[PDB]
Structure 1
Amino acid sequence: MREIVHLQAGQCGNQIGAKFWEVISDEHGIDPTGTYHGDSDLQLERINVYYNEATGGKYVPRAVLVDLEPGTMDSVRSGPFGQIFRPDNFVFGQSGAGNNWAKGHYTEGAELVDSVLDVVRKEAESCDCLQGFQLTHSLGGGTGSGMGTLLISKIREEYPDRIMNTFSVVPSPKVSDTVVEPYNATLSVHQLVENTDETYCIDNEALYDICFRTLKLTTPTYGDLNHLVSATMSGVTTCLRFPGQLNADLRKLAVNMVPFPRLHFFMPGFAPLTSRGSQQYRALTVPELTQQMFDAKNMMAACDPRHGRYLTVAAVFRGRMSMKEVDEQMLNVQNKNSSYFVEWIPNNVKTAVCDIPPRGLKMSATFIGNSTAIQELFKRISEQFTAMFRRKAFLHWYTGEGMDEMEFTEAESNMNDLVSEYQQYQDA
């Protein structure tokens, strides 16, 4: 009764959204046929957060797989846990679209959206206490972060206080996997910052260096980094399905987290991860894990924490702990690190301690920080529009459908409106 309605969109979010259901179903004892196999008691009694229940003693997810190109949905139907879903809500079409924002909100995504949202309407109007949404997308293309604004715009027209929980993969600094990426990423910032409340921003570059340094993996493929993102997926949902000593829903993890209505972007992180060689050599505690939470390397989005002050760090703990150790050792990280937190907030941290941790170690953790230092992510992308815009580069596709240059100038300021306010509030 702290519910979440799920969706997938784009190629990048479809995979990690599919690799969401690998992690959550192992926690809860479900078999892909839908038989409860877990021996522990507590896996069942809050299962309706993410799941409907199927008639005949069987279990079934609560999500809608959609994207415009049909290879990916047909790839997951042949996947590991493909046969769990409901076959009426696969809105997949054989047709395609060429990463253009214009057609996907005015012509080619307009035919699709009623069939898209009438099953987000179905699973919600037969619900008890709906509380949030979960849409896995990525910031770049005309299909991922194009359609992220399509599947959020008509929602807030009716839902008054429901808290959306999306997850977005940012453009990396050094490399590129789309030429026309600033020309489509800032196009969604016109609507997402108005409406989203959680976007777990992710760099692809920082995901490799955790694998290179801590994990000592030379070759992190795509079977790795989804399984690294997937921990902070089901790490924030500990006080939504489990008992615990300090409980909070997605709203309390917004009233604490959100200070002003447009600075609401979350940085992931999973503490007790180590390579196989030095795993015996390392002994973990509540003092030891709090290093790996507050380490400079265990952040899935690459920024420099030593170039900004944290607004609200909220690290969720999971397992059996001492809770002086929770509070005395999350002040020692604030006392010793003085100038790198805001002076106009007296206590900058908040814990959350659970009673059953996710599987893999005794004493798991997950650290979520809302810094100020992610303006350097914002500076580069907003620069990459305007210094490429001094020649009027790619407008002859989008102006076939009415994407005038009066739009693309003013949405760049709505990126730089965010830059001006971190500079307004870094020196306060």
Structure 2
Amino acid sequence: MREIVHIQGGQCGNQIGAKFWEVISDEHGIDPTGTYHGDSDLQLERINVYYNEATGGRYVPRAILMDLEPGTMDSVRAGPFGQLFRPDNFVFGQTGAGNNWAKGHYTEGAELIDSVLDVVRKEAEGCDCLQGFQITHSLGGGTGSGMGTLLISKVREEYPDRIMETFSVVPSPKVSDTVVEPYNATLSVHQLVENADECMVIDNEALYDICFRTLKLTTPTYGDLNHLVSAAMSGVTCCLRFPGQLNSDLRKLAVNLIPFPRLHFFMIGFAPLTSRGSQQYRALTVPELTQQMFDAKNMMCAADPRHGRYLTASALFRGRMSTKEVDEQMLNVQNKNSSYFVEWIPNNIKSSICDIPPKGLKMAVTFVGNSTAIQEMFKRVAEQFTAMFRRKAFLHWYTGEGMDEMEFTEAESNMNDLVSEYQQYQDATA
């Protein structure tokens, strides 16, 4: 019961998803051929959440892969774990969005979604009791941000009471691969705040720093960055698939983290992370995990958490540990840093404990925090947008496919409205 479905779109989303399924299958003991090879009963206890059951006893993930070109979806099938997914769930076009949000949301993306909504509707209908959706996509691309945000709107219309997760990779100025990133990123934020219940933002800038310094490996690639995100993604739903002292599903996280409906943008991080040469000098204890958890350099976002005030924060502990240690550590950090925690809400940290740690680790921690420091990212993105739009540069592509400059101004006002509304509580006092 209370199972969830997975949808991934674009190149960035597909690469994130292709590694997330690798991580999950390892925990539950599923080989790439879909045959169980585990050792404990708890691995097969709650497999209904992420997997379907087919004749012959093979498990298949309930995931939908969407894109507008077969370039990336041909590689994912030709590589490892390509036989895990159902061949009929692969849906894709033939042209490609061409890094144009208007093309991926108005002209070409709207034409394709008739097919993909059918398989999603079929998947969400055959389940016993749906819990929610989760989306992986990038806000800096055409098909990822274009079709991805449109798919959220229509699914929301059919499932008003279900919850939605989005693991979004927003583009930072320091690492830029497209020249029209500020345009389509801003347009994606407009529709995202309206429909998505929970939004987690990821930065390629921050992931590089973590891999450069904490893991101390000189040559990262997109393979390693996708793995860092994958570990956190499985951590959020860890307590949904394993027993624990304190149980908290996705809905419980939403209630305890969102004070007001429009403020649902979070930052995430993982612990422990140690280099190969320094892994035998560390001792795995709760007091040392909480130090790396709250480290400002460990967050997966370019925003500095010490530049604002934490509205609320959550920690998901995995492994064997005592609740007295966990509870007393979350109290101390709040008292020592009362300046960085907003003061009209007492004890704004929620703790959950799961009894099964990840693969090969005695203990692990996933941190999800809602802080006012996230405003800086939108401010610097909007600054790039207003310089480009004041000259109407590259705007003949969007105006040439049915959308007008009225929408561009309207979207900018809402995004600027969010920051002003979000920063209000940073200086608000009781």
TM over 0.5, shorter chain? yes
Residues in 2 aligned to 1:389 and 1:97: alpha-carbon distance in whole angstroms: 21
List, as ranges, runs of 4+ consecutive aligned residues in structure 1 with deviation greater than 4 Å. none
Q: Is the 8 A contact 1:2 1:249 kept in 2?
A: no
Question: Helix, strand or coil for the counterpart of 1:84?
Answer: coil
Q: Displacement of 1:422 after TM fit?
A: 2.1
CA displacement at 1:92 relative to structure 2: 2.3
Equivalent-residue separation in structure 2 for 1:18 and 1:241 (angstroms): 20
Matched with 2:151 is 151
- Equivalent residue number for residue 210 of structure 1: 210
* More deviation, 213-222/102-111: 102-111
Displacement after TM superposition at 1:392 (Å): 1.1
Once residues 141 and 333 of structure 1 are traced to their aligned partners in structure 2, the CA distance between those partners, rounded to angstroms, is 39
Shift in Å at residue 95 of structure 1?
2.2
**Contact map agreement 2:175 2:204 (CA 8 A) in 1:** no
Matches of 2:10 and 2:126, distance apart in 1? 27
CA distance in 2, matches of 1:198, 1:4: 14
The structural deviation recorded for 1:145 is: 0.9
Show structure 2 runs of 5+ residues with no match. none
Distance 1:320 1:28 in 2: 19
Q: CA RMSD in A?
A: 1.1
* Equivalent-residue separation in structure 1 for 2:312 and 2:3 (angstroms): 24
In structure 2, do the counterparts of structure 1 residues 109 and 127 end up closer, same or farther at CA, with 3 Å as the change threshold?
same
Residue 101 of structure 1, CA deviation: 1.8
Find the aligned partners of 1:77 and 1:247 in 2 and give their Cα distance.
36
Q: CA shift at 1:390, angstroms?
A: 1.4
Query: Which whole-Å CA distance do the structure 2 matches of 1:92 and 1:416 have between them?
Result: 34
1:208 Cα deviation (Å)?
Answer: 1.1
Q: Deviations over 1:286-328 (max 9, x none)?
A: 1011101011211111211111111111010000001010000
Distance in 2 (CA, whole Å) between partners of 1:109 and 1:211 is 35
Cα distance in 1 for residues equivalent to 2:288 and 2:104 = 49
1:4/1:132 contact within 8 Å kept = yes
**Residue range with higher mean Cα deviation, 394-403 or 109-118:** 394-403
* C-alpha contact 2:96 2:143 (8 A) present in aligned 1: no
Residue 19 of structure 1: CA displacement? 0.7
1:161-216 CA-partner distances (Å, limit 9, x unpaired):
11111111111132311100111111112211001122221010111111121111
**Structure 1 residues 347-356 or 88-97, which shifts more?**
88-97
| Shift of residue 386, structure 1, vs aligned partner | 1.1
Match for residue 140 of structure 1? Answer: 140
Q: Is 1:253 matched up with 2:253? A: yes
For the residues of structure 2 that align with 1:214 and 1:103, how far apart are their CA atoms?
A: 40
Could you tell me how far 1:237 is from its partner in structure 2? 0.6
- 1:265 CA displacement: 1.5
- Cα 1:44–1:233 change in 2 (3 A) is same
SS at match of 1:6: strand
Equivalent-residue separation in structure 2 for 1:46 and 1:267 (angstroms): 28
Q: Is the 8 A contact 1:70 1:95 kept in 2?
A: no
Asked if 2 retains the 8 angstrom alpha-carbon contact of 1:137 and 1:167, the reply is yes
User: What SS is found at the alignment partner of 1:306?
Assistant: helix
Task: After TM superposition, give the deviation of residue 104 of structure 1 in Å.
Answer: 2.3
Contact preservation (8 Å) 2:268, 2:369: yes
**Number of paired residues?**
428
Write the distance in 2 (CA, Å) between the matches of 1:296 and 1:329: 17
User: Is the Cα contact below 8 Å between 1:315 and 1:366 reproduced in 2?
Assistant: yes
TM-score (norm 1): 0.98
- CA deviation string 1:380-422 (max 9, x = no partner): 1111111222111122111222211111011101111111112
Residues 200 and 266 of structure 1 are in contact (CA less than 8 Å); yes or no, is this contact kept in structure 2? yes
- Per the alignment, in what secondary structure is the counterpart of residue 65 of structure 2? strand
Of Structure 1 and Structure 2, which has the larger fraction of its residues in helix?
2
Q: 2 CA distance for matches of 1:94 and 1:411?
A: 30
**Does the Cα contact within 8 Å between 1:317 and 1:365 map onto a contact in 2?**
yes
Moved more, 101-110 or 178-187: 101-110
Cα deviation digits, residues 132-165 of structure 1 (max 9, x gap):
1111101112211111211111111121211111
Deviation at 1:29, TM superposition (A): 0.7
Q: Which has the higher strand share?
A: 2
SS where residue 15 of structure 1 aligns?
A: helix
How many Å separate the matches in 2 of 1:422 and 1:188?
A: 18
CA distance in 2, matches of 1:95, 1:411: 27
How far residue 96 of structure 1 moved from its aligned partner, in angstroms, is: 2.0
Q: Deviations over 1:243-291 (max 9, x none)?
A: 0111111111101111111111221211111011111111121101110
1:68-115 Cα distance to aligned partner (Å, 9 max, x none):
011111111111111011111211233223121222222211221010
**Contact 2:109/2:146 (8 A) holds in 1:** no
- CA contact 2:189–2:415 (8 Å) conserved in 1: yes
What secondary structure sits across from 1:137 in the alignment? strand
Q: What is the CA–CA distance in structure 2 between the aligned matches of 1:293 and 1:2, rounded to whole Å?
A: 29
Return the offset for 1:223. Answer: 1.4
For residue 360 of structure 1, report the CA deviation from its aligned partner. Answer: 2.2
1:371 counterpart residue number: 371
Check if 1:173 corresponds to 2:135.
no
TM-score (norm 2): 0.97
Name the structure 1 match of 2:56.
Answer: 56
- 2:398 and 2:16 map into 1 onto residues whose CA distance is 29
